[PDB]
Amino acid sequence: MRHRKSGRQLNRNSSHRQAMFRNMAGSLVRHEIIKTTLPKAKELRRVVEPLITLAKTDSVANRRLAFARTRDNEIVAKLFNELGPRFASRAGGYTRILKCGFRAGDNAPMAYIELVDRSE
Amino acid sequence: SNIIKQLEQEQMKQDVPSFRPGDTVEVKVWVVEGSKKRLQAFEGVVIAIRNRGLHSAFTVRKISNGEGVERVFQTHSPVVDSISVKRRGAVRKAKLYYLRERTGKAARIKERLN
Amino acid sequence: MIGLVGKKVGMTRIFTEDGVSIPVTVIEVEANRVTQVKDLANDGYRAIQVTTGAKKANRVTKPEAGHFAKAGVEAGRGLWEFRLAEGEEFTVGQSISVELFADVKKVDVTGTSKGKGFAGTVKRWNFRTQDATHGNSLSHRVPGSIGQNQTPGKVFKGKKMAGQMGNERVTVQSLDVVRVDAERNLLLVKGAVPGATGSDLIVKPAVKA
Amino acid sequence: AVQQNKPTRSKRGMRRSHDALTAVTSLSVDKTSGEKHLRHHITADGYYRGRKVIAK
Amino acid sequence: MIQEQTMLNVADNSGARRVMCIKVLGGSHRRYAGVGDIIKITIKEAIPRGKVKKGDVLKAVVVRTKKGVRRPDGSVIRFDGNACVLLNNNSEQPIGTRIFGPVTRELRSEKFMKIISLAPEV
RNA sequence: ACACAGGUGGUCAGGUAGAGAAUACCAAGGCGCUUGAGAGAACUCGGGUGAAGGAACUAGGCAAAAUGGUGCCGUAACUUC
RNA sequence: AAUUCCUUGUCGGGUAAGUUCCGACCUGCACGAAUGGCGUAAUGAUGGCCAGGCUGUCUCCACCCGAGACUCAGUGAAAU
RNA sequence: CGAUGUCGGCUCAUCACAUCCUGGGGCUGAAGUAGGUCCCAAGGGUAUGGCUGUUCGCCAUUUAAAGUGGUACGCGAGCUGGGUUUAGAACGUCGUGAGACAGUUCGGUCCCUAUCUGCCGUGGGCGCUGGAGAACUGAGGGGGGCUGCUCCUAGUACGAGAGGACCGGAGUGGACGCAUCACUGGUGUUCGGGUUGUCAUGCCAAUGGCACUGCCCGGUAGCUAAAUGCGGAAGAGAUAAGUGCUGAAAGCAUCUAAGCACGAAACUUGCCCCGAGAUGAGUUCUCCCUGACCCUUUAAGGGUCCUGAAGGAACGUUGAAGACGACGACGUUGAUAGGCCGGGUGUGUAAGCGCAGCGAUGCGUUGAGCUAACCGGUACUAAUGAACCGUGAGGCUUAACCU
Incomplete structure (x- = not known):
C-alpha cells in the first residue's frame, strides 16, 4: 500500500535521518570506507554521489553549494580541485557496496560502503 | 496504435489567442436559451488558468466594481466562440483565489506591460 | 460470445454542438490471431482459441514454444479457448474484430480487481464507526457485530470481517457504446473500467435482451 | 477467558x-x-567474486 | 449545501430576511438540497401585509447555492448567498407577486415552471 | 522493594524576544534517557489540514476550534454610588 | 415551588413540536414568618432556558505525520 | 447464593406470518376514479425530530409499508452514566427516634494482553498415481430480483352527468449493491514561493537548525465523495391457492377415480462469479528422460558409480501484490530498482548582472530558477558463471480385435 511512497523508512525520525545522512556522506570523502548496515548504505548513494557530481559543473557561482543541502565544512576546500575535473565527469557509480552478512552474534545486516579511487 | 494525448486533439481548436492568470479576457459563448440561438458575452479577469488537455478549464471574475458574477469556461469548447484579451494583468502568483475574498479597491489588477 | 481483449489506458471527452462534453473511456483494439480451431474431435464441441496481439517472449519454456510453433511464427498474448454456441457463433471465413459492436450498444468487461490489503468493514461494506465523543475510547473502528447472546453458533456471509480482498476476476455490465471506428481500431464507451492501466479488459457485446 | 488445560x-x-x-x-x-x-555475501575472511576484499 | 438549521433569505416578496430549513424529505436518507430540490421551511419574520404568517410550515425550492446547476452540459453555473422560492403545496406555482435576484430557467418541473413567465430577464 | 516519570528544604543567575520567576530560540556549563536492525498493516494512543452547511451532535456547546497584542476612539440596562 | 395527588396542571409568550424556559391562575390534598418571611447589586469550581458569535460535536468523514501493534534477533513475567 | 451487571439509546440484523408495501383470486350497498374488505404465498421492500433517561405515551412533519410479533420481552470480556443507586445534602410528608418514600432536586466510580469451538484472510505438509507446462468441462453454491410522485399511452374504457382508469413507457426522486478518478472541491510533512522570532555561517548579501510542517499560500503523483457511472432480460423447462378439459364411482353432477392441459412478483436452465479433496479427485493439448554394479540372517534392505531432461525454486533488482508468507515484473539474450540527461504538470521570474532610485525597491536579460511520483532516451552503478532441487519411458486386474 503506502499510496505512492517509494523511499524506504529505515530507523529513527525523518529529522535524525536527515542529519545522519548529511554527516555520513560528508565524512565518507575523508574516511574512504565506512562500516554500517545494508538498508542504510543502499540509500547513501542517493546523497553521496550527487555531492561528488556537484564538482562536475565549473563556476564561481557553484562554490556556494553544499551549504543548504548535504553541508560539510572541509570538502568545500578540496573536492572542486580533486574530483571535479576528471572523476565527477562520470556523473555517478562512484560507490561500491560490500554485503558482509552478520556483524557478530546479533541480527543486523552488516555492510561496508566505499568510494572508487581509480577509474581505469 | 498510440491514442493517449492524441485522440483528444481531434476535438481541439486550430487557433486561440494566448493569455495568462490576471488577464482581462471578455469571452463570447453560444446559447439556445430554451428558444433560439444567440451569442452571449461574459466580462472579467482570469483567476485560474487552463494548461492541460482538451477539457482543461479557466475561471473568469467580473471584478469591475469588485463584486458581481464569476463563471468557468474551456478554450476548446464548441459553444465558446471568441475571446477579446482586452488587457494584460500584473500578478505575482499562479492562482488568484484571494480575489474571491477582496471586494474593494484591494481587488484591482494593474496593466502587465507585457 | 468472443472477447476482443482491449487493455486499459484512460478516459477522454469528445463533445457535441450543444456544448455537452461527453466523457468516454478509451480502448484501442489489436484483435485476435486465431491459433487452433477445434471442431467435433474433443467432446463434440467447437472452440476458436483466439490469442491476442504479439509479445517479446524472451525467456519462454519448451511447453509454450512447441505450441507457438503450431499457432504460427509470431508469439501472441494469452490464450482464451472461447467455446462457440450452435447456430449462434461461427469460426468460418475472415476472423472478426469490432463489427461485434455495429448494432449492439451494451457491453460487459471482465478484468482483475485492485488489492485492498486489510480491506476491513467501515469503507468496503458500508458499516458505521463508533464515535470518539462522550469519554469513549479503545474501540472506534474495531469490528465486533458478530453475535447476540449465544443463539447464532454459526456464521453467514451477511457478517463481514478483515482479510485480503482484490486480485481476482471482476466483471462490470454498466457500459454503453458511444462511438466505434473500425479504421482507427477504436472503441469509446460511457462509464468506468475496473483495476489498473494495462491489464487485460476482455470486452464482449451484451447477451441480455 | 484463560488457559484451562495445558x-x-x-x-x-x-x-x-x-x-x-x-x-x-x-x-x-x-x-x-x-x-x-x-x-550474494562476502565471507568474514574477505572472499567474493575473485576480489578478496576488506580481509583481516 | 443547504441543510438542517440553515438560516437564509427568501426570493419571493413579503417573506423577510430570515427563514429556517427544517429537513429535506421526499424519500429515504434525505440530506442536503440542490437547485430545484424541494425542502421543508419555517417562516420567522414575514411582513404583516403578506399572505403567510410566523411558525406556519411550508415547502420551498433552492434557487441559489454554490454547488450551482450542471444538468445542461456538465459545466457548473453557481450562485452567491443561499436562497429559496416558496411553493404552494395544493394549487402549485410560487406564492409572491415579485421575485428577487437574476434567477435561472433550469427550474422546469410543471409545479414551478411559471418562474420563467415573470418580470426577470430569464 | 526495581539503574521506579512518585516524595523531598536552603543557595546563585545571562543573551535576544517578554510587564514577568510565563514562554520561544540560545550562551556558559551539562547531557544523548545502559537492547538492536527493518517493514510501512487494520487497529489503539498522540499529532497535522480540511470544502459547503452549523449544534442539526448529545441528557446537555461536553469536547474542540475561533478570538487573543498595543495605541486612539466608543460604551447599555441594572445599581446598595 | 427542589414542596403538587388528577399534574408531563390550565392559559398567554418563546419551538416545526417543549415531561423543560418566562409570566399569569388559586383549588398551597402538605410554602409561611429566626425552626425565619419577602427583596435587590458586584460576585459565585451553581441547577434550568432564549438569541447571536465561533466551531469536524454533527451532515460524512477524507487525506497527511509519529509511537505501540507487525518481522527477525537480544536478555526474558502473570492469573490459570 | 464459589454472581447469566440494572431501563431506554447507538451499533447490528435475523427469523416468523394471524401479509404491512409488492403479487394471485374475489364480494361489494364495485356503474367509472377512489373507497369498504376476505382468502393464498416469506422472493424483494417498510420515518425523523421536540420536552422527556426514557423506547414508549403526547406532538410536529413525512411513507409504497412507517404492519402485527419472536430473538436472555434480541444492547457492557461492545459503548455512554441519563433512568436505577448507596456514602455529602435539601424540599415536602410520615415515623417519639436512630430512618424512611420504585416521592422530589443538585451531586456522586464503568476492570479485562484471549486456550478452544465460532469466524476472516493467509503459508507449509499430504492426496489426485512417470515428471513437467497450461487451458477446458461442471457435481453443486452465491449474486441479480422493490418502488413513491407526475406526464404520455387516454377525455380512450365507464357513467344522466360531474369526473376519469388498465397493458407498456418516459420525466424526476429514493432505498440497496457494485465500479471508477475523466469531472470538481478537499488533502497532498519526498515539489515551489512568501514571512515572524532566534541561534549559526567573522559581518553583510544569501542559506540552514529549532520554534504545532513555527506561520502563510499554491499544488504534481495518488487517495476521496463533499464527485461521476450503473441494475433486477428474452428463449427453453417445471411449480401451492387459483384457471381446468373429457369423465366414472353416485344415469345426473363433478378438476380425479382411469386419462390429459393452463399458471405467480416465486423457481431450474439461460447471464455474472466461485467450483474436480466432485477421494465419484473428469478432459485435452504443448514439453522431456530410453542406466549399471557389490553385499545380506534378502521375495526385502543397506552401499557405490554413470547420467540428470523438460521444469521449479533459492539467491538477487523489487512491485501494479502485502502485517508475515504467497504472488505480478526484470537478472546483462537486461528498462526490474537507483542514477544521469531532458520533457511535462506544479510553482512563479530567483541567487547574479545591467540600469533607475536617498533607499526600501522596480524593470530588462527572464515564461527565470527549482522538482517527486507523470512521460522519453540511457545500461551510467547494481541484479556472476554456476551451485541447488527435479532422474533414466514410469503399479495391479480384465475384455475384444488383428497376430
Whole structure:
C-alpha cells in the first residue's frame, strides 16, 4: 500500500535521518570506507554521489553549494580541485557496496560502503 | 496504435489567442436559451488558468466594481466562440483565489506591460 | 460470445454542438490471431482459441514454444479457448474484430480487481464507526457485530470481517457504446473500467435482451 | 477467558515444525581462489567474486 | 449545501430576511438540497401585509447555492448567498407577486415552471 | 522493594524576544534517557489540514476550534454610588 | 415551588413540536414568618432556558505525520 | 447464593406470518376514479425530530409499508452514566427516634494482553498415481430480483352527468449493491514561493537548525465523495391457492377415480462469479528422460558409480501484490530498482548582472530558477558463471480385435 511512497523508512525520525545522512556522506570523502548496515548504505548513494557530481559543473557561482543541502565544512576546500575535473565527469557509480552478512552474534545486516579511487 | 494525448486533439481548436492568470479576457459563448440561438458575452479577469488537455478549464471574475458574477469556461469548447484579451494583468502568483475574498479597491489588477 | 481483449489506458471527452462534453473511456483494439480451431474431435464441441496481439517472449519454456510453433511464427498474448454456441457463433471465413459492436450498444468487461490489503468493514461494506465523543475510547473502528447472546453458533456471509480482498476476476455490465471506428481500431464507451492501466479488459457485446 | 488445560507435547511439535529461519542452503564459488561463500555475501575472511576484499 | 438549521433569505416578496430549513424529505436518507430540490421551511419574520404568517410550515425550492446547476452540459453555473422560492403545496406555482435576484430557467418541473413567465430577464 | 516519570528544604543567575520567576530560540556549563536492525498493516494512543452547511451532535456547546497584542476612539440596562 | 395527588396542571409568550424556559391562575390534598418571611447589586469550581458569535460535536468523514501493534534477533513475567 | 451487571439509546440484523408495501383470486350497498374488505404465498421492500433517561405515551412533519410479533420481552470480556443507586445534602410528608418514600432536586466510580469451538484472510505438509507446462468441462453454491410522485399511452374504457382508469413507457426522486478518478472541491510533512522570532555561517548579501510542517499560500503523483457511472432480460423447462378439459364411482353432477392441459412478483436452465479433496479427485493439448554394479540372517534392505531432461525454486533488482508468507515484473539474450540527461504538470521570474532610485525597491536579460511520483532516451552503478532441487519411458486386474 503506502499510496505512492517509494523511499524506504529505515530507523529513527525523518529529522535524525536527515542529519545522519548529511554527516555520513560528508565524512565518507575523508574516511574512504565506512562500516554500517545494508538498508542504510543502499540509500547513501542517493546523497553521496550527487555531492561528488556537484564538482562536475565549473563556476564561481557553484562554490556556494553544499551549504543548504548535504553541508560539510572541509570538502568545500578540496573536492572542486580533486574530483571535479576528471572523476565527477562520470556523473555517478562512484560507490561500491560490500554485503558482509552478520556483524557478530546479533541480527543486523552488516555492510561496508566505499568510494572508487581509480577509474581505469 | 498510440491514442493517449492524441485522440483528444481531434476535438481541439486550430487557433486561440494566448493569455495568462490576471488577464482581462471578455469571452463570447453560444446559447439556445430554451428558444433560439444567440451569442452571449461574459466580462472579467482570469483567476485560474487552463494548461492541460482538451477539457482543461479557466475561471473568469467580473471584478469591475469588485463584486458581481464569476463563471468557468474551456478554450476548446464548441459553444465558446471568441475571446477579446482586452488587457494584460500584473500578478505575482499562479492562482488568484484571494480575489474571491477582496471586494474593494484591494481587488484591482494593474496593466502587465507585457 | 468472443472477447476482443482491449487493455486499459484512460478516459477522454469528445463533445457535441450543444456544448455537452461527453466523457468516454478509451480502448484501442489489436484483435485476435486465431491459433487452433477445434471442431467435433474433443467432446463434440467447437472452440476458436483466439490469442491476442504479439509479445517479446524472451525467456519462454519448451511447453509454450512447441505450441507457438503450431499457432504460427509470431508469439501472441494469452490464450482464451472461447467455446462457440450452435447456430449462434461461427469460426468460418475472415476472423472478426469490432463489427461485434455495429448494432449492439451494451457491453460487459471482465478484468482483475485492485488489492485492498486489510480491506476491513467501515469503507468496503458500508458499516458505521463508533464515535470518539462522550469519554469513549479503545474501540472506534474495531469490528465486533458478530453475535447476540449465544443463539447464532454459526456464521453467514451477511457478517463481514478483515482479510485480503482484490486480485481476482471482476466483471462490470454498466457500459454503453458511444462511438466505434473500425479504421482507427477504436472503441469509446460511457462509464468506468475496473483495476489498473494495462491489464487485460476482455470486452464482449451484451447477451441480455 | 484463560488457559484451562495445558497444550500437549504434540502441539509443541506442531508449532516447531517450521522453526528453521535458515536451513542452511548451498554456497557459491569464487573466481581466483579455491574458496566458497554465502549467496550474494562476502565471507568474514574477505572472499567474493575473485576480489578478496576488506580481509583481516 | 443547504441543510438542517440553515438560516437564509427568501426570493419571493413579503417573506423577510430570515427563514429556517427544517429537513429535506421526499424519500429515504434525505440530506442536503440542490437547485430545484424541494425542502421543508419555517417562516420567522414575514411582513404583516403578506399572505403567510410566523411558525406556519411550508415547502420551498433552492434557487441559489454554490454547488450551482450542471444538468445542461456538465459545466457548473453557481450562485452567491443561499436562497429559496416558496411553493404552494395544493394549487402549485410560487406564492409572491415579485421575485428577487437574476434567477435561472433550469427550474422546469410543471409545479414551478411559471418562474420563467415573470418580470426577470430569464 | 526495581539503574521506579512518585516524595523531598536552603543557595546563585545571562543573551535576544517578554510587564514577568510565563514562554520561544540560545550562551556558559551539562547531557544523548545502559537492547538492536527493518517493514510501512487494520487497529489503539498522540499529532497535522480540511470544502459547503452549523449544534442539526448529545441528557446537555461536553469536547474542540475561533478570538487573543498595543495605541486612539466608543460604551447599555441594572445599581446598595 | 427542589414542596403538587388528577399534574408531563390550565392559559398567554418563546419551538416545526417543549415531561423543560418566562409570566399569569388559586383549588398551597402538605410554602409561611429566626425552626425565619419577602427583596435587590458586584460576585459565585451553581441547577434550568432564549438569541447571536465561533466551531469536524454533527451532515460524512477524507487525506497527511509519529509511537505501540507487525518481522527477525537480544536478555526474558502473570492469573490459570 | 464459589454472581447469566440494572431501563431506554447507538451499533447490528435475523427469523416468523394471524401479509404491512409488492403479487394471485374475489364480494361489494364495485356503474367509472377512489373507497369498504376476505382468502393464498416469506422472493424483494417498510420515518425523523421536540420536552422527556426514557423506547414508549403526547406532538410536529413525512411513507409504497412507517404492519402485527419472536430473538436472555434480541444492547457492557461492545459503548455512554441519563433512568436505577448507596456514602455529602435539601424540599415536602410520615415515623417519639436512630430512618424512611420504585416521592422530589443538585451531586456522586464503568476492570479485562484471549486456550478452544465460532469466524476472516493467509503459508507449509499430504492426496489426485512417470515428471513437467497450461487451458477446458461442471457435481453443486452465491449474486441479480422493490418502488413513491407526475406526464404520455387516454377525455380512450365507464357513467344522466360531474369526473376519469388498465397493458407498456418516459420525466424526476429514493432505498440497496457494485465500479471508477475523466469531472470538481478537499488533502497532498519526498515539489515551489512568501514571512515572524532566534541561534549559526567573522559581518553583510544569501542559506540552514529549532520554534504545532513555527506561520502563510499554491499544488504534481495518488487517495476521496463533499464527485461521476450503473441494475433486477428474452428463449427453453417445471411449480401451492387459483384457471381446468373429457369423465366414472353416485344415469345426473363433478378438476380425479382411469386419462390429459393452463399458471405467480416465486423457481431450474439461460447471464455474472466461485467450483474436480466432485477421494465419484473428469478432459485435452504443448514439453522431456530410453542406466549399471557389490553385499545380506534378502521375495526385502543397506552401499557405490554413470547420467540428470523438460521444469521449479533459492539467491538477487523489487512491485501494479502485502502485517508475515504467497504472488505480478526484470537478472546483462537486461528498462526490474537507483542514477544521469531532458520533457511535462506544479510553482512563479530567483541567487547574479545591467540600469533607475536617498533607499526600501522596480524593470530588462527572464515564461527565470527549482522538482517527486507523470512521460522519453540511457545500461551510467547494481541484479556472476554456476551451485541447488527435479532422474533414466514410469503399479495391479480384465475384455475384444488383428497376430
